[PDB]
Amino acid sequence: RMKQLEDKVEELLSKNYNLENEVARLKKLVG
């Protein structure tokens, strides 16, 4: 359950970086 929470943090960070990369691409298009 400790490991499960750790896995979830790691998964959400990966998703966050994927979203940050998307934001950056879209801002490059607008900018």
Examine residue 31 and tell whether it contacts a second copy (CB under 8 A): no
Q: How far is the CB of 3 from a second copy (least distance, A)?
A: 10
Q: How far is the CB of 8 from a second copy (least distance, A)?
A: 5
Examine residue 28 and tell whether it contacts a second copy (CB under 8 A): no
Examine residue 29 and tell whether it contacts a second copy (CB under 8 A): yes
First to last CA, the chain: 44
The number of residues that bind a second copy (CB under 8 A) is 18
Tokens found for residue 18: 């994927």
Q: How far apart are CA 6 and CA 24, in angstroms?
A: 27
